[PDB]
Structure 1
Amino acid sequence: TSSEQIMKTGALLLQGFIQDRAEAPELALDPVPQDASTKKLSECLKRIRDELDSNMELQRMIAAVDTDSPREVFFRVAADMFSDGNFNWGRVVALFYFASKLVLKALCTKVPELIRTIMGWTLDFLRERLLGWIQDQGGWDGLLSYFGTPTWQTVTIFVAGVLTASLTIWKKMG
């Protein structure tokens, strides 16, 4: 519940979204030693991550993102997504899911320098805008509770609900 701890687990999770699906090996980021706690979180998020991968309306919007000049697209999404001073785990999770495919959309266009670059922005944005609220949720473990074991496909609708809804605004305001 020290920033450190939250930052730490944060990168770990973030990296989870990424390396699970897909590039100079010398600059690679050595996998972060998971333990029990962060095991169930990641075990969970990969379950979300595929229901989301399977949401087309989201996939469409995702497809509409600047595949290789995404500095601005990320920070404007992240801004709007919490533009209301509230926070739920849905929102956090989505931001993470979004960042993930930002990468996969760049790895495909083969610009691996940015793995780091994006992982940078997020965890930055984590610290600047969320470290507080998470700290005040007893840390990440709350996020498990956000996902009880039958209600997968339901929350996921609402969680894509917001992410789509925000990409969409970006899509029109330029």
Structure 2
Amino acid sequence: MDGSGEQPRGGGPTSSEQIMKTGALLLQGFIQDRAGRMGGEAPELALDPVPQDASTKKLSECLKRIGDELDSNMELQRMIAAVDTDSPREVFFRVAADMFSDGNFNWGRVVALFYFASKLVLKALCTKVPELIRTIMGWTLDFLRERLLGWIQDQGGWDGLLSYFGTPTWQTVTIFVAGVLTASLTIWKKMG
């Protein structure tokens, strides 16, 4: 009966928790893909069910390539290497609130945060500490459930992100992302 009813292409089910669940999957793909650059520990067994979903796959693709391209600039690269890894939560909290004070829903404040987060994850991974890797992920989702979820739901899920992915004049977008990251870092590294 319900299916026999008139439905415009699809339906409108609860995407509130759905979006949250998608975030947990997205973070996995992005981390797993980049973690492969470390090698492994001899996969005698391993669990490979093969990613069935193409949504997260496509999203991780663009994120991976962009994040990888954002490492070409040795200028910003060395700037990250000049960070103070004393207070992991405080550093993350600062940059989280920093790009929130203005309340600018430019979307870039999210993708920029992803690059910063992945850099920290990679750094911790190089220290051989899986524990912290799980902690950073929890913090990333923490802020997401805190306020981000409210903005993602409003835009109809990750539709906004899929529409934010442009191409023309992408160079300016690159400078935009770099500038945002630089700004927060400038307020962080205040002489020490």
TM-score normalised by the chain length of structure 1: 0.84
Contact 1:67-1:109 at 8 Å conserved across structures: no
Q: Which runs of 5+ in 1 are unaligned?
A: none
| 1:74 Cα deviation from its structure 2 partner | 0.8
Contact 2:29-2:56 at 8 Å conserved across structures: no
Tell me which moved more, 43-52 or 111-120.
Answer: 43-52
Equivalent pairs: percent with the same residue?
99
Selected match of 2:28 from 11, 15, 38: 15
User: 1:31 aligns to what?
Assistant: 49
Deviations along 1:60-100, one digit per CA (max 9) or x if unpaired, are: 22112234641211111111012212222211111111111
Tell me which moved more, 64-73 or 22-31.
Answer: 22-31
Q: Which runs of 5+ in 2 are unaligned?
A: 1-13, 36-40
Structure with higher RCO (Cα < 8 A, 6+ apart): 1
Contact 1:99-1:118 at 8 Å conserved across structures: yes
In structure 2, C-alpha distance between the alignment counterparts of 1:29 and 1:162, rounded to whole Å = 39
Q: CA RMSD in A?
A: 3.1
Query: Highest CA radius of gyration, 1 or 2?
Result: 2
Tell me which moved more, 93-102 or 32-41.
Answer: 32-41
Deviating above 6 A after TM superposition, structure 1's stretches of 4 or more consecutive aligned residues are 23-32
| 1:143 Cα deviation from its structure 2 partner | 0.9
Distance 1:95 1:25, change over 3 A: farther
In structure 1, C-alpha distance between the alignment counterparts of 2:49 and 2:178, rounded to whole Å = 28
Contact 1:68-1:106 at 8 Å conserved across structures: no
Distance 1:84 1:140, change over 3 A: same
| 1:37 Cα deviation from its structure 2 partner | 2.7
In structure 1, C-alpha distance between the alignment counterparts of 2:27 and 2:57, rounded to whole Å = 13
Distance 1:116 1:31, change over 3 A: farther
Distance 1:107 1:26, change over 3 A: farther
User: 1:137 aligns to what?
Assistant: 155
Tell me which moved more, 117-126 or 10-19.
Answer: 10-19
Distance 1:20 1:162, change over 3 A: same
| 1:55 Cα deviation from its structure 2 partner | 2.7
TM-score normalised by the chain length of structure 2: 0.77
Provide the aligned length of Structure 1 versus Structure 2: 174
In structure 1, C-alpha distance between the alignment counterparts of 2:22 and 2:50, rounded to whole Å = 9
Deviations along 1:36-59, one digit per CA (max 9) or x if unpaired, are: 333322221112112212233321
| 1:16 Cα deviation from its structure 2 partner | 2.9
Distance 1:26 1:160, change over 3 A: farther
Equivalent positions of 1:35-46 (< 5 A) are 35-46=53-64
